[PDB]
Amino acid sequence: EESFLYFAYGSNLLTERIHLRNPSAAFFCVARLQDFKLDFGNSQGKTSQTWHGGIATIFQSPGDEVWGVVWKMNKSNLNSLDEQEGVKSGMYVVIEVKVATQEGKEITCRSYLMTNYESAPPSPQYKKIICMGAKENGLPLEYQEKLKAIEPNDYTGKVSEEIEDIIKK
To answer: What is its EC number?
Structure first.
């Protein structure tokens, strides 16, 4: 009531990652988003200089599904999370989603998706982040198979130091 539920399906799948900016986020549960397909891309044609590859987004697609994690956060983080997801610059738009745990319990969450972008593969580093998250929080083993099968781009240049070590370990 005083806190809000955030459903993420990308880099914020990894606890260590979401904790960088949101160290008070609390794992709430794993859930599925039906009729939504995952994808990666360049917002407004721009290539993320943080990840050096497409960034995660979703769109409505019958049959497809997206698995993520519901994180409980304080409502005081609202604006912080929005600005964190580049809403002001048109990068991402705020969305309300209705997902459900593997037990069949539906949950209403806040999430994000780009409305103007061009598909682009993720950097090998961005991919490792999500995979490390999917494994960690125990998303369905099969869904992880889809994430692990993602073809990354050819980037091996320097990357975020505080992200390098997360990946190293």
So the answer is: 4.3.2.9
